[PDB]
């Protein structure tokens, strides 16, 4: 319907400019005829999810690169894709005028945008907040009589989540994660730093903390919001680190195992929110398979754990095969899910690089690798940030797919938005990864899935500078002849019946 | 009750450190016996409103400096003293834990603090806000059907104002001032820059703007808050300047005259808030007496104008005698009131100088000069700021008497707090300035007033480095023998019957 | 010869990219035939001093805008245009490889560039320095035996000035200005802050300071550099301001009058550098005509003062007519000269806005207004800065027409460069402003001059978004039919005989 | 001779204020009589290396904490202590008037100060520079005909190093480290970012880079300065990182091994500067023992490597035992040396915290831990910085033990200065760490050494808030009865 308004800020590619009266958008999804394929293309040179069509040909000759679909090789089913409604994200969105707000929300959540079906919701404050608060800051309130949702939830996050669900055509799943407990439950008596829950699993401290989860779910339920899942703690390894600068709560794998078994599991199961899934880890995949072994070999813990949530920050130390692959081999009925990722947090690098194609490629490369190693979903961090990469009370400024400029009632959609969109828009919940084999060695990253209706989807990422001619073979329908330009990402879709 | 915990940040004096469990405070006011005086002393060296007592002596010999009270020379009556509940101030206060918040509010508003009886409340956003908003941003809403108070008022400012009034023993007067109108009422269609109300006094634009004042008062009344006064516009000269960087609305004196006469006056008088006072100017005293002449010689305007509000920012160009003095001589029944002051806004100077004695002296020197030229009250700007002197969306960072450090649940009371306190605590509403004459030339600044009950109050400021021995003669009671140390401020109190 | 390589950084227009092997440049100046005009055009849309030609027509009909040249209405003669060789500028230039350096110097100083004929040279350190040195820091050296030029002059500034003069086809005039004296000559004993020369005019402190000027001129003369002029002090009002953050030396107008009369004038006149011109003020035009009255009504001072130097920073408070116009009316034989301007120092703006058309328009609007009110030249501040707008030891970062990126051996020519070039390239020394009248009210800014050879030059600036059709009438040659596009600047040239 | 002039800037403790006519200083070292001990004390409350004395007692009774010297348990010998003469440090020192400059240099280098005997010298520009130069920026000069020292070396660094050596009573050792090579030797063609030397070890690129080291040493030798050591590269891991913001040159451990073996080692050994030591790593101790294994198991490399230089920045991820301890166990004849440390680079802290006792304790805790795990020296980063923690061309502003205020001709000596001084002043080169055992579990950090003359030195750091009564037993002389106050550091000295 409406194309990208490009704008360059001196980095490798452009952002797309949106405001109160204009944002780039798609037409309603059309299902093209059998024998034809759809291609969506984004390039470093400036193309943004541009729609073209072509014939699926009966015959193919040549020695070029062939990618062959293997529809009978079936792997994981997809839960979905999305991002995080932090205080910072909510503040930035609400800094826009209402019509601009709606265009931003439509960009993420509607079929005229990229069709997000996951929202991650922090349980109280994190570093992407303007103050340190929990839901129960009144000291020594073990009964949680003074548990309440502050303005951040009731005026910022909750109304935006409602508006997002109203705009979405797909069912949206909410995922909750806590950073810190109330400080009076902690060994160090502070929101940050090295510190765990006081005492031991089973006791009042741990039972109060478990009950805080239920209190959270109750309060959100009173606001007509239900959660698909919760995590046992955001990045539990962080709270084991001396001087950790922002909200954390430390758990060893054993401590998490026992907390799940003795407190969190039973308390959730004995509540009105017993259908809510519990995800473990919510931390770096370097910690796998060890963390999964420790927790899931205890059947008292394992019976409460639906899945394993992973963050991307130490992926460079942790090959996917040895972590994700090995965890799946050992525990094939426990889903693997990517729950957080952002660029810009490395201490030496710039927080926000407006129009960075490299950062887009990091997102799409990560999603592909995750999908090739059994992962069922992928979740961005902050949905929106300001040009500094904030607000953030500890100055841990990072990048986001959408950057909001409050002073100009304007927002910028980065390459990250579109790279994520190449998956989120075209891989609905219940899609299944299928086999895809290359005829020769190549520099492309690619994944193939089948939608619930049987139609095919293939994403092809070219991180090299060289254009790669290629053919996609579907045994049922024929051959898709195409080119993968240098510094491009393509999504291919076609009917198989 | 509790002394100052001093802390130095490398400037000329100390701040007083407060937190969740400790803040410096006074005992309840005792009325000492006839024949004795109370002295409160603050010094650059570290004393903070320290209480001592002494005898009033029958006789006095010597050639030393004599200040002689003239109780029959009567001048203006005092309305009061206070500061501004901006979005920035409210945000900073609410960044503290609740017990720390209460200690801050007690510091300003209780008799255990400095007894503020004025709070200035911006009507919607100013530069000390995190976003630009008015109460009626829905375009062309001349009816003001979509007028509403956002979270800044309902969750931040209003609850804090309630809590302040609960802590105050004296009646607190609220003063409201707008920075900008909705942009659709303005010639330039923006919150900032050179721009006035569209059209002319009498018309729909001006009637809508007048009605916005009533809508504001209604909304605050629904929250159980009544206003003593409103100003016709914050700094109307600012909106006459090309490129003025933050929220403004330009009025010439003629435009303000005609707006008051045709729109604002009648609309207020014909409402349930007809008892609310209207102050004019709310701008630099350099604009007097001209601005007062233009407005108050029109009886159609003059009949609605209770007083003239002045800001201190161009005082260096505008001698008090020729501005305040001359305005009083011409219009003696129209009160002069100081409605805004802050240090740190000069483009070349540091915004926040923690522990600056110089900035304290600027406050007390200004208050004295104002009181010596018919001014009935003096109002600080932001009640609290962060260590950067914000938040502020245009980076117009300035200083404040209280600096809040969110990361340490701590606030710092600056010399400005105490210099203001030397007046606010000891000069209740209805006090009257009286004569005070020096026997010889001196470097001190001094003012004398009488409380409603007839008791005396004298403030003595020494901005020199030399200790000045002095005597205060009251003809009724006798002689107060004392010393004014270098870089000190003293308040003296005594019964006369 | 070589066009602009455009590059966008997200602002309203483009920069032109230069490096070791490429920079945009002009062909040698051609003099087109009588009956034809040359037009050089720069636009927000991307045109950079593009050459076109057209006929001067015999007849003209229509009701459109007519600008009529009045060649017999003669006003001031032009000294020239240029910028400042600060320590920061020199460091940034020398950060490039030698071939890139030469392309930068050629851009400014050659006839293949924009033909600068003025270089302003600070006398020792200012804020655009990496340290706070004077030429005589050895304490109490009233004889100035230890006066010497440090590395900043001998290795950075002086060699670059030589290279600039080698590249220039027009004679280049050097202008010197001091920021601070040695601290041992100052009341405050520091390079910055409120402080003046110790004592009084006539005395040793003032005689030493006067002699420092001669010592400076001697040292530069030993390096084969002669000065056209010196200023009595850079921004003398700055040293009257408490807490002024960088190098300054305070003078009231009286103090400057008496310093010139008693010390600086006589010392210069009695030296080998007696032909060097002395300019007064070197400060904001808001200070005129008062400052000119105070100095020039004393004949003992007036006889040493060739001219009055003005800075642009408070132009928004100081209409040209009432300051520049009035000063000229009173003192028509004392030239007015604009000695410093930069954008980016306002706290609410970015220091550097790469590709800002607005900033270009500020330069050309200022130059036109100055030329329309008797000003004989206009001088930019730093010739080059880094992308942060530095280096600057007090963080007073600002913009510059050329921004150097050290890590890429690249420099960027901003719209400011071209807006300044529209004058500097086409208004040689000795050109004379002549009359130019508009047939009706309009939004254009325009000025007409005559070169020494009698040829005409007209600059037309359009700061509006509307294209303005217009005609220029020269009674001697005929009618130039043209359009002034929105957000454009044009320079028109033609022979009159 | 002259006490600290204290000044508070709102942090946990005071700085000591110095200017053109005043700086705090010590009297000449006295050697007190056998049977007595000297104690130097610094406290958070304001004491700055204050001298007191007491008796060594014949007998001791009680259940209190006993620290027992074990003079026959001998460990590493100490090379020394010091800091870095960066462009930023030099500029800040030279911003002072000459008499103030001399008081600053005396503070660090004289016996009236804290007796530094190491100066680290960057080879051309780093982040603590005002511009991005190398010694050979003329392109493709593989012969290095246009190699030269710019103004930063000849007018700032070299004259200050001369002045420091003149003031020093102990021999001073110079240590050189490069950040980047000329850009025309690099794969990325830039001073910063991800990039290594072009080609492979053995080739012209690597031979030129090796020759640059010799050219550097030659040029400094022409200015009458000799180096004790050089490092193979400052933080070689940095140049492996995409977008690394300042001067770097990337080496894997294999690349460094092969560069040392094929180029740097042979070129140094075949020059007039063959006695100069070569240190490897010059990077985070997290990289050990792996990096040491990779390099030192190749005898072609190992034969050129005198020692291993470590930086402290990732110490929080890298326990000393598993890194320093394990490296020493594997390679006991290869010295471990701490070549760089500074506080203030973490994004969530202030770069400069004037008067921070915490930052002092970080220095002394680090030095003790290093000394307890075989480390032979400890080197601070910038010798002086401005109040912003600069100058620094990429805004990587950090803290320094001395902060110079140019506008007031004043400098501030931080707790870091004194915490470092508690070791540097009292642990001369050739001192040997000896055993020291605690009678019970405690919160103190302590180390014992013996000077070359046989006299004893013990440093005791108390990072807790609790005063700890304690006794030091020397079997030869007797018992030192003392107290370690909360938030204190003590150095004890005695003849044996
Ligand atoms: C801008 O000129 C359009 C009008 C803006 C609307 C009014 C703004 C009010 C609040 C403000 C501000 C502001 C205004 C002007 C300047 C600055 C802040 C910074 C200043 N830069 C500047 N000033 C001086 C100077 C010295 C002594 C006396 N007057 C001015 N000198 C400078 C030297 C070098 C660089 C910047 C300087 C202008
Ligand atoms: C200053 O000049 C004198 C000679 O007049 C000379 O002896 C002295 O060394 C010079 N330099 C300084 C720093 O005093």
Burial C363-385 (b: 16+ CB within 10 A, else e): bbbbbbbbbbbbbbbbbbbbbbb
- Of all residues in chain D, what percent are helix, strand and coil, respectively (each to 5)? 25, 30, 45
The total of structural domains in chain D comes to 2
**First vs last Cα of chain C: how many Å apart?**
28
Count other C-beta atoms under 10 Å from residue C167's C-beta.
Answer: 19
Task: Please give the positions of D annotated as active site.
Answer: 235, 340
Q: Mark which of B380, B397, B431 sits at the end of a domain.
A: B431
Report which of B205, B92, B109, B209 is spatially closest to residue B162, judged by C-alpha positions: B109
Please answer whether residues A304 and A340 qualify as being in contact, where contact means their C-beta atoms are separated by less than 8 angstroms: no
Question: Does the CB atom of residue B347 touch ligand 1 within 6 A?
Answer: yes
How many residues in total does chain C contain? 497
How many residues in total does chain B contain? 497
Q: Which residues of B touch C347 (CB under 8 A)?
A: 347, 394-396
DSSP-assigned letter for residue D321:
I
Q: Closest ligand 1 atom to the C-alpha of C342?
A: 35
Sign of CA dihedral C371, C377, C378, C384: positive
Q: Is C269 exposed, middle or buried (0-12, 13-18, 19+ CB in 10 A)?
A: middle
Question: Which of the residues D5, D10, D353 would you substitute to probe the B interface, choosing the one with the greatest number of B C-beta atoms within 10 Å?
Answer: D10
The reported resolution of this PDB entry, expressed in Å, is 2.2
What are the structure tokens assigned to B225, written together?
Answer: 């808050």
φ, ψ at B187 (rounded to 5°):
-60, -35
CATH number at residue C485: 2.60.40.1180
Question: Which of the residues D179, D237, D239, D243 would you substitute to probe the A interface, choosing the one with the greatest number of A C-beta atoms within 10 Å?
Answer: D243
- Pairing assessment for the beta strands A307-311 and A277-284 based on DSSP bridges: parallel
The CA angle C357-C362-C367, to the nearest 5 degrees, is 125
Q: Mark which of D383, D410, D431 sits at the end of a domain.
A: D431
- Rounded (10°) CA dihedral D341, D347, D353, D358: -60
Domain match, D496 and D365 both: no
- Integer CA distances (angstroms), C112 to C27, C30, C80, C494, in order: 6, 12, 17, 20
Sign of CA dihedral B381, B382, B385, B391: negative
**First vs last Cα of chain A: how many Å apart?**
28
Cβ-based neighbours of B145, under 8 Å, separated by 6 or more: none
Give the separation between CA D308 and CA D428, rounded to whole angstroms.
21
Kindly calculate the radius of gyration of chain A based on its CA atoms and give it in whole angstroms: 23
| SS3 track for chain A | CECCCEECCCCCCCEEEECCCCCCECCCCCCCCCCEEEEEEEECCCCCCEEEEEECECCCCCCCEEEEEEEEEEEEECCEEEEECCHHHHHHHHCCCHHHHHHHHHHHHCCCCCCCCEEEEEECCCCCCCCCCCCCCCCCCCCCCCCCCCHHHHHHHHHHHHHHHHHCCCCCEEEEEECCCCHHHECCCCCCCCCCECCCCCCHHHHHHHHHHHHHHHHHHHCCCCCCEEECCCCCCHHHCCCCCCCCCCCCHHHHHHHHHHHHHHHHHCCCCCCCEEEEEEEEHHHCCHHHHHHHCCHHHHCCCCEEEEECCCHHHCCHHHHHHHHHHHCCCCEEEEEECCCCCCCCCCCCCCCCHHHHHHHHHHHHHHHHCCEEEEEEEECCECCCCCCCCCCCCCCCCEEEEHHHCEEEECHHHHHHHHHHCCCCCCCEEEEEEECCCCCEEEEEEECCCCCEEEEEEECCCCCEEEEEEECCCEEEEEEECCCEEEEEEECCC
Domain match, A352 and A399 both: yes
Q: Which residues of A touch C9 (CB under 8 A)?
A: 8-10
Cβ-based neighbours of B418, under 8 Å, separated by 6 or more: B42, B48, B49, B360, B489
Residue C182 C-alpha to ligand 2 middle, in angstroms?
16
Question: Does the CB atom of residue C290 touch ligand 1 within 6 A?
Answer: no
Domain match, C115 and C48 both: no
Please answer whether residues C26 and C421 qualify as being in contact, where contact means their C-beta atoms are separated by less than 8 angstroms: no
Domain match, A71 and A153 both: no
Q: Which residues of D touch B354 (CB under 8 A)?
A: 10
Please answer whether residues D162 and D243 qualify as being in contact, where contact means their C-beta atoms are separated by less than 8 angstroms: no
Give the separation between CA C473 and CA C496, rounded to whole angstroms.
12
Name the H helices within D71-172. 87-94, 98-109, 151, 158-167
Q: Mark which of C415, C431, C447 sits at the end of a domain.
A: C431
ω into B289 cis (within 30 of 0):
yes
Please answer whether residues D129 and D393 qualify as being in contact, where contact means their C-beta atoms are separated by less than 8 angstroms: yes
Beta strands in C146-276 (DSSP E): 173-178, 229-231
Domain match, D353 and D387 both: yes
What are the structure tokens assigned to A226, written together?
Answer: 């239900």
CA distance D48 to chain A (A): 28
What are the helix and strand counts (H, E) for chain D? 13, 21
> Ligand nearest B347 Cα, by number?
1
* Residue labelled with tokens 């995949």: A285
φ, ψ at A272 (rounded to 5°):
-65, -15
CA distance B387 to chain D (A): 13
What are the structure tokens assigned to C398, written together?
Answer: 């600002």
**Domain containing residue B477:** 35-77+432-497
Task: Supply the residue whose CA is at minimum distance from atom 11 of ligand 2.
Answer: C146
DSSP-assigned letter for residue C183:
G
Domain match, D147 and D94 both: yes
Task: Using CB atoms, pick whichever of D155, D192, D407 lies closest to residue C191.
Answer: D407
Please answer whether residues A477 and A496 qualify as being in contact, where contact means their C-beta atoms are separated by less than 8 angstroms: yes
In the PDB record, what is the listed experimental method? X-ray
Sheet with strand C15-18: strands edge to edge: C6-7, C15-18, C410-413, C402-405
Domain match, D195 and D225 both: yes
CA distance A349 to chain D (A): 6
Q: Per the CB < 8 Å rule, is A137 touching B406?
A: no
Domain match, A203 and A272 both: yes
> Ligand nearest B395 Cα, by number?
1
Given the residues B340, B388, B429, B481, select the one marked as catalytic.
Answer: B340
Give the separation between CA A354 and CA D278, rounded to whole angstroms.
44
Domain match, D177 and D49 both: no
| SS3 track for chain B | CECCCEEECCCCCEEEEECCCCCCECCCCCCCCCCEEEEEEEECCCCCCEEEEEECECCCCCCCEEEEEEEEEEEEECCEEEEECCHHHHHHHHCCCHHHHHHHHHHHHCCCCCCCCEEEEEECCCCCCCCCCCCCCCCCCCCCCCCCCCHHHHHHHHHHHHHHHHHCCCCCEEEEEECCCCHHHECCCCCCCCCCECCCCCCHHHHHHHHHHHHHHHHHHHCCCCCCEEECCCCCCHHHCCCCCCCCCCCCHHHHHHHHHHHHHHHHHCCCCCCCEEEEEEEEHHHCCHHHHHHHCCHHHHCCCCEEEEECCCHHHCCHHHHHHHHHHHCCCCEEEEEECCCCCCCCCCCCCCCCHHHHHHHHHHHHHHHCCCEEEEEEEECCECCCCCCCCCCCCCCCCEEEEHHHCEEEECHHHHHHHHHHCCCCCCCEEEEEEECCCCCEEEEEEECCCCCEEEEEEECCCCCEEEEEEECCCEEEEEEECCCEEEEEEECCC
Residue C138 C-alpha to ligand 2 middle, in angstroms?
9
B235 assigned to active site: yes
Domain match, D124 and D248 both: yes
Sign of CA dihedral C262, C263, C264, C267: positive
How far, rounded to the nearest angstrom, does the alpha carbon of residue B87 sit from its chain's CA centroid?
17
Residue A141 C-alpha to ligand 1 middle, in angstroms?
55
Please answer whether residues A68 and A60 qualify as being in contact, where contact means their C-beta atoms are separated by less than 8 angstroms: no
Cβ-based neighbours of C207, under 8 Å, separated by 6 or more: C263, C267
Burial B168-193 (b: 16+ CB within 10 A, else e): beeebbbbbbbbbbbbbbbeeeebbb
How far, rounded to the nearest angstrom, does the alpha carbon of residue D334 sit from its chain's CA centroid?
18
Give the separation between CA D79 and CA A359, rounded to whole angstroms.
46
Please answer whether residues B177 and B122 qualify as being in contact, where contact means their C-beta atoms are separated by less than 8 angstroms: yes
C340 assigned to active site: yes
Q: Per the CB < 8 Å rule, is A137 touching B97?
A: yes
Report which of C386, C376, C466 is spatially closest to residue C423, judged by C-alpha positions: C376
Domain match, D165 and D105 both: yes
Question: Does the CB atom of residue C346 touch ligand 1 within 6 A?
Answer: yes
Q: Which residues of D touch C407 (CB under 8 A)?
A: 132, 190-192
Q: Per the CB < 8 Å rule, is D408 touching C190?
A: yes
Helix (H, G, I), strand (E, B), or coil: what is residue C274?
coil
CATH number at residue A23: 3.20.20.80
Give the separation between CA C241 and CA C415, rounded to whole angstroms.
34
Q: Is B257 exposed, middle or buried (0-12, 13-18, 19+ CB in 10 A)?
A: buried
Give the separation between CA A355 and CA A341, rounded to whole angstroms.
18
Sign of CA dihedral A441, A446, A447, A448: negative
Q: Per the CB < 8 Å rule, is B394 touching C348?
A: yes
The CA angle B236-B237-B242, to the nearest 5 degrees, is 115
Sign of CA dihedral B324, B326, B329, B334: negative
DSSP-assigned letter for residue C161:
H
Please answer whether residues D11 and D403 qualify as being in contact, where contact means their C-beta atoms are separated by less than 8 angstroms: no
- Integer CA distances (angstroms), A412 to A49, A407, A416, B212, in order: 16, 13, 11, 35
Domain match, A319 and A372 both: yes
φ, ψ at B161 (rounded to 5°):
-65, -45
- DSSP of D17-72: EEESS---BPPPPP-PPTTEEEEEEEETTS--SEEEEEEEES---SSSEEEEEEEE
Q: Is C36 exposed, middle or buried (0-12, 13-18, 19+ CB in 10 A)?
A: middle
Q: Which residues of B touch D7 (CB under 8 A)?
A: 10
> Ligand nearest C346 Cα, by number?
1
Please answer whether residues C54 and C40 qualify as being in contact, where contact means their C-beta atoms are separated by less than 8 angstroms: no
Sign of CA dihedral C209, C212, C214, C216: negative
- Integer CA distances (angstroms), C415 to A195, A374, B249, B287, C487, in order: 56, 54, 32, 39, 12
Strand partners, B123: B178
Helix (H, G, I), strand (E, B), or coil: what is residue C89?
helix
């Amino acid at each position: 319907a409406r194309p990208c308004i490009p704008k360059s800020f001196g980095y490798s590619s452009v952002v797309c400019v949106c405001n109160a009266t204009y944002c780039d958008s798609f037409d309603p999804p059309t299902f093209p005829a059998l024998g034809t394929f759809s291609r969506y293309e984004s390039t470093r040179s400036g193309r943004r999810m541009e729609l073209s069509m072509g014939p699926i040909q009966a015959n193919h000759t040549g020695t070029g690169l062939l990618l062959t679909l293997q529809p009978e090789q079936k792997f994981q089913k997809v839960k979905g894709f999305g991002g995080a409604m932090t205080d910072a994200a909510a503040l930035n969105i609400l800094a826009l005028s209402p019509p601009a707000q709606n265009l931003l929300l439509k960009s993420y959540f509607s079929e005229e945008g990229i069709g997000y079906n996951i929202i991650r919701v922090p349980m109280a404050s994190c570093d992407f907040s303007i103050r340190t608060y929990t839901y129960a800051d009144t000291p020594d309130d073990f009964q949680l009589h003074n548990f309440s949702l502050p303005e951040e939830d009731t005026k910022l996050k909750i109304p935006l989540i409602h508006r997002a669900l109203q705009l979405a055509q797909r069912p949206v799943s909410l995922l909750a994660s806590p950073w810190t407990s109330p400080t009076w439950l902690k060994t160090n008596g502070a929101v940050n730093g090295k510190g765990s829950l006081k005492g031991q699993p089973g006791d009042i401290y741990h039972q109060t903390w478990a009950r805080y989860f239920v209190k959270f779910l109750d309060a959100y339920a009173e606001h007509k919001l239900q959660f698909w899942a919760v995590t046992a703690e955001n990045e539990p390894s962080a709270g084991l680190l001396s001087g950790y600068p922002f909200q954390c709560l430390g758990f060893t794998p054993e401590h998490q195992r026992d907390f799940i078994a003795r407190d969190l599991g039973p308390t959730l199961a004995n509540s009105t929110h017993h259908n809510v899934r519990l995800l473990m880890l919510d931390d770096q995949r370097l910690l796998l398979p060890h963390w999964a072994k420790v927790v899931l070999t205890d059947p008292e813990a394992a019976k409460y754990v639906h899945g394993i949530a992973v963050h991307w920050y130490l992926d460079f130390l942790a090959p996917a095969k040895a972590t994700l692959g090995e965890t799946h081999r050992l525990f094939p009925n426990t889903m693997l899910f990517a729950s957080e990722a952002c660029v810009g947090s490395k201490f030496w690098e710039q927080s926000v690089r407006l129009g960075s194609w490299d950062r887009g490629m990091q997102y799409s490369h990560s999603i592909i690798t995750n999908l090739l190693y059994h992962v069922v979903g992928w979740t961005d961090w902050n949905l929106a940030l300001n040009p500094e990469g904030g607000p953030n009370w500890v100055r841990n400024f990072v990048d986001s797919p959408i950057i909001v400029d409050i002073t100009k009632d304007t927002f910028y959609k980065q390459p990250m938005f579109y790279h994520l969109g190449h998956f989120s828009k075209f891989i609905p919940e219940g899609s299944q990864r299928v086999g895809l084999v290359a005829s020769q060695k190549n520099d492309l990253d690619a994944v193939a899935l089948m939608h619930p209706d049987g139609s095919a989807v293939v994403v092809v990422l070219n991180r090299s500078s060289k254009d790669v001619p290629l053919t996609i073979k579907d045994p049922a329908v024929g051959f898709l002849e195409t080119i993968s330009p240098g510094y491009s990402i393509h999504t291919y879709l076609w009917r198989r019946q």
